[PDB]
């Protein structure tokens, strides 16, 4: 028959663009259709909305030519049974991978068979209609229900609806849905197949309210307001039916509406008779922003003119408002400041399903690290998020699901009128189901798609339709007139980067290139792949400073998080760097900049405290009183001036003492440390009476004094052992170290198959600063009046070329001190190594880390802003940071201070500690895989370079950042317990 | 125009003052009579230091109509006001902006993109060479390169730059 498989698969509608639905419904805004309208205002369950989401058969075929005729009416004897919210690569079905003909789809097409046997009742059969919902189907489906085919459906990230009253009997039903991996669609979503969002059942009455949308205008000064509600009813039109618009704060109704059907007149013919439109006035509205979710209740009851109720339909209702002016995005007439984060939709251990408390946990930590804006990635998310962001305060921009980023061209199907009715089904749809969320700030018109003339004609569509919201889209160059603001991808603050036709300017000169007038925020910067974030501050010092650089958006919040969200340490630094309070230092004074638009500080209290080298002297604390966009001024009471030698720091933090919705009580938002005032040590160690001894064999130099000995290798140069009574502590030599781990940004995209040679890592290993062998030049061993000098000096040679000398002096006097000095030349020509230090595996193993020095967290000198200087101690653990991909971590900057087991080194460097060498980081290629080695590995550096961040294709460590002097001097002192 | 009055406490009390209008009026409109038909002559200034009044927007305007092949520069006012073509800030710096009350300096980058600004930006005087001098000029010169409507300056007094005696400075290398 015409439900057969042979039928209905012989069109191939999956290989068609100009078939992108059959038999589907219109989109609008989530409905429940309650039947009572205390419960649509109380947000209660509907009786009317019934989850189908559970146990369902499931079958697997290599291609939908391959499906038996019977599992059109009975489910197959092999099916597997599985929760349907799910994606089938998730049991074992066909593999998914990370990673040609634009209709047409590869023929061995994987094909899920989904089933379902549920129970109808006799009431939802009597009357009404009743549809079913399927929130998302991964890429293209064919529907059955009782054996009878209903429908076809695409965009997988939109809900598809279908009317099922004439396909529906009494008791027992069968849902049959046949799944494709790819179809046309797939074009337009350049994996992870399935039926992965919610499916319901929705009943609603034969008069049935079909849409309504809310929109906000407000006068001047935002103190009045209008709410228009446009409704739209469907079915029989009667003299009747009326239409109620009530709004609630809370238990309290501040406004209601009631009229007939029938608009006002649009044209010669008339107006619409279904639809009415509803004025409400709201007088001193409480206004929705992020530091202020104020959120109404919008109630609209369908019923009759005596008073009996059809069905009710309720929102969330944010008074708000988005415009550009003067080049500058205002919301509620105020300059935003964007920190945003672009997010995916990820779960931890369940691939694309998405369920509300992980949505809840992401919200929570985002406005814990102070984001206040979301990208929805490359497509429209849970319907649920957005209203977990109207109620807690984030703004969303909201994406179109159109990516054709593996089109040569580019713009080849975005430029093509014959895929303008496919790309305008996943604009209009996503614009016509969340249009009314407050959160909602921004339209995007899709992810890296090249410009096209559909991009003009969509972008036109939406500032039609919806005028209250600004429309962005990056691409053809992230300044065409399909977009509002200017949003370059990874644009760099300083440095240009003049591409062919789709040039990436420095965002400071973008902004002022000749005509230019719209805002600049950034819809990805900063990528997080592995260790990276350096050169964040950079951003955030362009952003304050430039009022039309309003933000962006950071890439890959899942990330700056692990899978199981454990915060990565650059999450710290995001966190220090769009903090709202920033601070100022005058003589005893602190001023506090509030960065907040709308809030007072009445959740805020300044701590401060002065402390010596890490032992604090005094603190206090102080509430804040500071206006948004406010000062206020902070005398601090009389400092101590030790006259102890050391540096006095001075550290201030934001506290609020009440917990939030987001927050917990004692939560620190906001930081900033100053250094004081530093007395110089001019005092002298007291002139010791023994003297070390120095004994010479043609194999070693060794020294002895008390129970300690160094012994020194004459053939290579570097101390090679030292013991303490008769134990050794030195497991490798200590010796110098040019090379690190390379990082993701170190590698870029070079591949062993395909190499980059301008990446980092590239240029390292072909000037052979891996394989760089060190020669020993001089050796001198001295004993002096109280001391004994030993003198090295050492040449790194690869292929005939110098590229490295380092010459060190070794002081040992009579206190058991032994004083390194360290002079390194590096040549101009090799290219500037990754680091200039020293590195030994120490023979002990010890539980503690203890360090005077920058931050606990691991920091770089390109990131480090966050981190503060005083006393930490860790276990040796949290000094080793668990990159999927291992590199180079866990350094600690600024650090004057460190102690391990019975060592003691004094001095000005950077250091990791671990029980991985760089050796093993490099040769691994996934952390889980490392191996804990016999001792400890310290790596000392005087100098480090920069990790990048800006991207992860090419080099990104700026030029202040880099090991470029060519001659390097430090010095460091290794003692032990006495 | 030889019109300076820096020394003004309000410094546009004569400016801002219509019974001053005469006479500024004459050294605008005579120079312009003077030297309009001189090739090298493509920028008219409308004077030094003197605040910014209405007789610098009626001034303007005059010029303007008279002689609409040549814009109208003037600093004063904050070096961007009504009366210019050309935003002219007087040392204003590539990347530190120094904000005064109501004549802010900002650095010429961020000058550039204030919101609703379209103005080229040359700096009148900027670069003082005042004795061992100089410092940072490389610094004005990659941001005249790399931005459009940074369009140069003026360095302040060519002698100076040389002595008296025209003796070169090391500062001109």
């Not at 044209?267 to 279904?274: L, M, Q, S, T």
């Not at 054709?404 to 303008?420: E, F, I, K, S, Y």
């Not at 004459?714 to 110098?736: A, E, H, N």
Request: proline content about 6%.
């Amino acid at each position: 028959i015409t439900d057969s498989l042979a039928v209905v698969l012989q069109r191939r509608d999956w290989e068609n663009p100009g078939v992108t639905q059959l038999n589907r419904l219109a989109a609008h805004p989530p409905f429940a259709s309650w039947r009572n309208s205390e419960e649509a205002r109380t947000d209660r369950p509907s009786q009317q909305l019934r989850s189908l989401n559970g146990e369902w058969r499931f079958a697997w075929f290599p291609a939908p030519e391959a499906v038996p005729e019977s599992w059109l009416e009975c489910d197959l004897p092999e099916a597997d049974t599985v929760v349907v919210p799910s994606n089938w690569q998730m049991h074992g079905y066909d593999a998914p991978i990370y990673t040609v003909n634009p209709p047409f789809v590869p023929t061995e097409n994987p094909t899920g068979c989904y089933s379902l046997t549920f129970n109808v009742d006799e009431s939802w059969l009597q009357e009404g209609q009743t549809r079913i919902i399927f929130d998302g189907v991964n890429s293209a489906f064919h529907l059955w229900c009782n054996g009878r085919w209903v429908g076809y459906g695409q965009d997988s990230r939109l809900p598809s609806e279908f009317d099922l009253s004439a396909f529906l009997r009494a008791g027992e039903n069968r849902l049959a849905v046949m799944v494709l991996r790819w179809s046309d669609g797939s074009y337009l979503e350049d994996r992870m197949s399935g039926i992965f969002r919610d499916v319901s059942l929705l009943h609603k009455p034969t008069t049935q309210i079909s849409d309504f949308h809310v929109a906000t205008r407000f006068n001047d000064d935002f103190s009045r307001a209008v709410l228009e509600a446009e409704v739209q009813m469907c079915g029989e039109l009667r003299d009747y039916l009326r239409v109620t618009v009530s709004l609630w704060q809370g238990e309290t109704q501040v406004a209601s509406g009631t009229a007939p059907f029938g608009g006002e007149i649009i044209d010669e013919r008339g107006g619409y008779a279904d639809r009415v439109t509803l004025r409400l006035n709201v007088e001193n509205p409480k206004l929705w922003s992020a530091e202020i979710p104020n959120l109404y209740r919008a109630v609209v009851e369908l019923h009759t003119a005596d008073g009996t109720l059809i069905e009710a339909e309720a929102c969330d209702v944010g008074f708000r408002e988005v415009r550009i002016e003067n080049g500058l995005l205002l919301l509620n007439g105020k300059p935003l400041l964007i920190r945003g984060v672009n997010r995916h939709e990820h779960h931890p251990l369940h691939g694309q399903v998405m369920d509300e408390q992980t949505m809840v946990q992401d919200i929570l930590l985002m406005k814990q690290n102070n984001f206040n804006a979301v990208r929805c990635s490359h497509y429209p998310n849970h319907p649920l998020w957005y209203t977990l962001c109207d109620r807690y305060g984030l703004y969303v921009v909201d994406e179109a699901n159109i990516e054709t980023h593996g089109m040569v061209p580019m713009n080849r199907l975005t430029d093509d009128p014959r895929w303008l009715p496919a790309m305008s089904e996943r604009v209009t749809r996503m614009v016509q189901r969340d249009r009314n969320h407050p959160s909602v700030i921004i339209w995007s018109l899709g992810n890296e798609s090249g410009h096209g003339a559909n991009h003009d004609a969509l972008y036109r569509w939406i500032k039609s339709v919806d005028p209250s919201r600004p429309v962005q889209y990056e691409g053809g160059g992230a300044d065409t007139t399909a977009t509002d603001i200017i949003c370059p991808m990874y644009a760099r603050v300083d440095e240009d980067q003049p591409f062919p036709a789709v040039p990436k300017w420095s965002i400071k000169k973008w902004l002022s290139l000749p005509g230019e007038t719209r805002p600049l925020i950034l819809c990805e910067y900063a990528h997080a792949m592995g260790n990276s974030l350096g050169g964040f501050a950079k951003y955030w010092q362009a952003f304050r400073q430039y009022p039309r650089l309003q933000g962006g958006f950071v890439w890959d919040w899942v990330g700056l998080v692990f899978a199981d969200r454990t915060p990565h340490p650059a999450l710290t630094e995001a966190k220090h760097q769009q903090q709202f309070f920033q601070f100022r230092l005058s003589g005893q004074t602190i001023e506090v900049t509030s960065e907040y638009l709308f809030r007072h500080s009445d959740n805020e209290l300044l701590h401060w405290m002065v402390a010596l080298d890490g032992k604090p002297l005094a603190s206090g604390e102080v509430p804040l009183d500071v206006a948004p966009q406010g000062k206020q001024l902070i005398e601090l009471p009389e400092l101590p001036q030790p006259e102890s030698a050391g540096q006095l720091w001075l550290t201030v933090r934001v506290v609020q003492p009440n917990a939030t919705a987001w927050s917990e009580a004692g939560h620190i938002s906001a930081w900033q440390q100053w250094r004081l005032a530093e007395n110089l040590s001019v005092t002298l160690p007291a002139a010791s009476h023994a003297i070390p001894h120095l004994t010479t064999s043609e194999m070693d130099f060794c020294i002895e004094l008390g129970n300690k000995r160094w012994q020194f290798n004459r053939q290579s140069g570097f101390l090679s052992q030292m013991w303490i009574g008769d134990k050794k502590q030195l497991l490798t030599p200590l010796r110098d170290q040019f090379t690190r781990a390379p990082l993701d940004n170190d590698i870029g995209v070079s591949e062993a198959t395909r190499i980059d040679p301008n990446a980092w890592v590239e240029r390292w290993k072909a000037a052979g600063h891996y394989q760089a062998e060190a020669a020993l030049l001089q050796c001198t061993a001295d004993t002096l009046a109280d001391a004994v000098l030993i003198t090295t000096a050492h040449a790194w040679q690869h292929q005939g070329k110098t590229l490295f000398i380092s010459r060190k002096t070794y002081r040992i006097d009579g206190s058991g001190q032994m004083a390194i000095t360290v002079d390194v030349e590096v040549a101009s020509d090799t290219p500037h190594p990754a680091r200039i230090g020293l590195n030994c595996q120490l023979a002990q193993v010890a539980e503690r880390v203890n360090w005077l020095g920058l931050g606990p967290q691991e920091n770089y000198p390109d990131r480090l802003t966050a981190a503060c200087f005083d006393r930490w101690d860790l276990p040796l653990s949290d000094m080793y940071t668990p990159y999927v991909f291992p590199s180079e971590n866990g350094l600690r900057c600024g650090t004057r201070e460190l102690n391990y087991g019975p060592h003691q080194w004094r001095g000005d460097f950077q250091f990791n500690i671990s029980r991985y060498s760089q050796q093993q980081l490099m040769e691994t290629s996934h952390r889980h895989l490392l191996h804990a080695e016999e001792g400890t590995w310290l790596n000392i550096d005087g100098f480090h370079m920069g990790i990048g961040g800006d991207d992860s294709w090419s080099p990104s460590v700026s030029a202040e950042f880099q090991l470029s002097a060519g001659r390097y001097h430090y010095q460091l002192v290794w003692c032990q317990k006495g």
